[PDB]
């Protein structure tokens, strides 16, 4: 995540980092937690 930007690199699974980065913009993590597949497909289509 961004935990290496402050101190030591502290690992975290990418769905959970994605969840907190959704929490940082206003929405709650549950929207991501049942839209994970759609979010991943949108990310892949955009990066393609």
């Amino acid at each position: 995540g961004w935990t290496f930007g402050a101190g030591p690199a502290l690992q975290i699974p990418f769905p959970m980092q994605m969840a907190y980065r959704f929490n940082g913009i206003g929405v709650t993590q549950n929207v991501l937690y049942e839209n994970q597949k759609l979010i991943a497909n949108q990310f892949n289509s955009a990066i393609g």
């Binding site: 769905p15 937690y33 049942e34 994970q36």
Partner: peptide, 23 residues
């Protein structure tokens, strides 16, 4: 619907508080 959800129990604070006084 959640991927990777594990099985565990939560603790309701009201459950042991209602029956100690009423029952």
């Amino acid at each position: 619907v959640v991927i990777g959800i594990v099985n565990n129990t939560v603790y309701d604070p009201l459950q042991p508080e209602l029956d100690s006084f009423k029952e």
